[PDB]
Design a protein around this ligand. Structure first.
Ligand code: HEM
Length: 116
């Protein structure tokens, strides 16, 4: 699906091919950018606090729990996507791997069936 790996500060570490197609950023452009560039406000400005809250409390909220959210493409367009993150440790520091399943087609099919 699309895959993104970030470090404990929300910085993109790895960014898969399918992620590039989905979000519109190339791997080099994406890497080193904060994961919040992938979501609209008000979430964008808060994401760091979310990662910060968890880091500090050690109390999971959305770890291993998939939820539907609104993502943002490079061109400004937004779209619903299913997201699940796994926590992993490497080199002593924590990393988070997210799997994204695009849901636009589902949202359109559902909107359309409702309209008809
Ligand atoms: C691109 C669309 C995304 C949106 C809209 C989004 C939104 C959110 C929200 C609302 C929260 C906190 C929810 C709560 O308090 O229960 C959160 C937490 C978090 N997100 Fe995201 N996120 C996005 C993508 C990502 C990705 C791709 C990663 C991992 C590579 C990620 C990593 C995290 C982490 C580490 C937390 C903290 C977990 C916790 O507090 O339990 N997010 N996100």
């Amino acid at each position: 699906d699309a895959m993104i790996v970030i470090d404990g500060h929300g910085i993109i570490q790895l960014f898969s091919t399918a992620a590039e197609r989905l979000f519109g950023w190339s791997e080099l452009e994406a890497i080193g950018q904060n994961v919040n560039i992938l979501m609209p406000e008000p979430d964008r400005s808060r994401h760091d606090s979310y990662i910060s809250r968890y880091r500090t409390t050690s109390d999971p909220h959305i770890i291993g729990i998939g939820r539907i959210v609104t993502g943002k493409r490079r061109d400004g367009t937004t779209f619903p996507m299913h997201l699940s993150i796994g926590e992993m440790q490497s080199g002593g520091e924590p990393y988070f791997t997210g799997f994204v399943r695009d849901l636009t087609e589902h949202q359109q099919t559902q909107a359309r069936l409702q309209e008809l």
